[PDB]
Amino acid sequence: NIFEXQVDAQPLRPCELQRERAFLKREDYVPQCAEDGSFQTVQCGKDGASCWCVDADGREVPGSRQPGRPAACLSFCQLQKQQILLSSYINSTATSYLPQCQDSGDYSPVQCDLRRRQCWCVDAEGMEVYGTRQQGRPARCPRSCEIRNRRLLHGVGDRSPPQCSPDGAFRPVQCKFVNTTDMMIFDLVHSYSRFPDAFVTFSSFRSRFPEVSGYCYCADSQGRELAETG
Amino acid sequence: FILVQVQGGPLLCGLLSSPDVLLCHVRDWRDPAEAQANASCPGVTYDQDSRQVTLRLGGQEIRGLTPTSFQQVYLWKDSDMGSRSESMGCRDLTTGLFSPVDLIQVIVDGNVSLPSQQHWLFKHLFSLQQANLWCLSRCAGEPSFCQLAEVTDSEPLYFTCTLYPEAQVCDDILESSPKGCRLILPRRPSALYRKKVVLQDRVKNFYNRLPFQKLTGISIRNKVPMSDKSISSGFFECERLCDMDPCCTGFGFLNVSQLKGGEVTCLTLNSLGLQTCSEEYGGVWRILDCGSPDTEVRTYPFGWYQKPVSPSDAPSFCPSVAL
């Protein structure tokens, strides 16, 4: 479970919103969500008597409902390929892009148009990472923690850069600073750039920022704070 | 008169009377991949569309009967064009995008390599007001090539409207101001107008920070001070300035004059030169250039940034740069 410190709007994905609303209304079907917040491709029912497959939006794929767990469900990358191809047959469209899926079923990190002319990087949900479209395969697709850090420099979110692993993923332990006076997140990106000498020791840090305390927590794969670990 | 010989086809011989704008010059950067539908400059088009090559010269389109090679116009220089009796049986929202350039900043070296697109607007129907508006409107219609538009009236029959890409040339000194940057144009322009840079909302490239801290033999395109901004805002602007330059291969976001306290600076580059002094290597044994104390390029988010590596090269009009 995730619950961030300062944010007013929690970064909950649609499955996690529909799961919480259903558990509250004591419905007999409560959506099952993956660790990253996506719908699991197999959705069970009350006691698992009936189970079906779903698409990326949680909509049941017709003909899949079954007593017992379905033997195989198409991934969201593969289910998008079907809807594009049927669309052209149903509604004439000269396709320019068909998703490329890894053999595990997830989206390939690099996605190319059918002319192999333009390519871009997608996230784990098939969504284009902005600024990655170019001619030919991108040499190195940025990872989630690196993307979060760049968007922070463009004015998105708070001013505390998350700590990244060498591969570009989030480190499991995330640490930020809190200004205890106004109870706000300490502006780390600007303070570090203007006062790099204040970060040599904790003696020099608390001399310059005497009201600032540390706040660390466990983060999930998307960098979101796990509930009640701060 | 116009003379046209499509390759191994019929030969056209058009006569001209009171033309308004001669438009395509043999030495003009033409867009390598430009749709023939969008009034492509060379009139010939649709070669064998249905085995017929249409010619849209003048204002009149030849049917297309053609089974290119030579195409020229000729002009009677000492013409009576402007002073001719009519009985002889003859026949503002864009000016705000530009800003005049102080002609003094221009250096005139006739030998410079600068691609251009020339036009002749004839004076018998063009006033200097209209010529300045025709020239500016045409520059704003070529958003991939034209950064500068100059107008000249040093000729008796026509105004000259030549469009340039960015003409600024800088030295490789890491400094916050553009004082070693000059405009080099082949001729003195009567009026020189620069399209105002407009920053898009989003960045178009995901720039990669170089691991190297020292660059040798760089080529700078522009120097912009950023000390009146937050570090986050300055980085965001530096990214979008290199986005707007088709010849930019990367930028530097750094403190210069660090011995006097440092000044936040954006340097757009069209060549990164020799990249040395990586933080990952040279730990026990360093031989290359390192340790420049008047520059701060280490602290996040300072650094040298590269536009993502693509096998598609820069536009052909971009200046050639070599170590």
Next chain:
Amino acid sequence: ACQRPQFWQTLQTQAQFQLLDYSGLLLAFQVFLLDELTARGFCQIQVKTAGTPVSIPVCDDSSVKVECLSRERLGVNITWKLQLVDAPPASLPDLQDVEEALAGKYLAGRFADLIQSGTFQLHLDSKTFSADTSIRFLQGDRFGISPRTQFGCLEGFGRVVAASDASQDALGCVKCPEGSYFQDEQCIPCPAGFYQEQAGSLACVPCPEGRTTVYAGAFSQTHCVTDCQKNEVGLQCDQDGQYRASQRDRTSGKAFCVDGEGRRLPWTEAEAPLVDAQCLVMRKFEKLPESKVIFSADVAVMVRSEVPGSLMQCLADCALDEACGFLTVST
């Protein structure tokens, strides 16, 4: 041509089953069937290693081919191609171990049971396409009841050993050389006017528009040649591969000038050597046959310039007159 042979690089098995309208685009069903095969794990080999199991991909976009045989019964071809560079040498030591992993209980035996059962159906907009219980295996033009493997080469490598006698010779793959491109298991020489410089390529780079190649199988940029350089009649050429304006005959020292094309202009053949600069001016004139000339009264330019010490010189005077339209020369 002569290159180093290499070992067989790929292994291949093919099976056929039937899916139970026409005159339509079936290539959609090729993607749909591959997705269903991928979903149930028939496009990977899983090797029971000690710790982490490696996965060998055995499919591509060409793996599934469908043909329409009769109404309500489609014909499906499935082809598993293993690249030997992906087979882990620690888990599958011998090439026999690789064959049995591709044609045994983990890939092909596990797929024959699924088809023979009756539990393979494809979900397509609430419609169901269940598969017939019959499955057949290619065995070298004779569809048998047991899978046989077939050796092959990688993308850029041409076959030099026939498929049948792959059991006899192990070196069956050669990389396409510098003069060549790859298509369809063969290495084909760059055609005339095209050149390739790097081996194992898929196409031939065309020569620059002003140049071509004298023969096929060109293997460098310099092999693209102009019309002058190819010329064999002895005409000398300047740099940049353009015809030298001034020429001298092979048999005699007699000197003549040629046009932009190699056409040898007559009436410029003179005993005195002509410098190229002398031919440039004469190249800009044309000599009129008598049929185009009329002898009658007209007016002559009165130029009284320093009289020479000369047709070559006389033409040059007209070449800078800007009023001279033409001239005549006496004997």
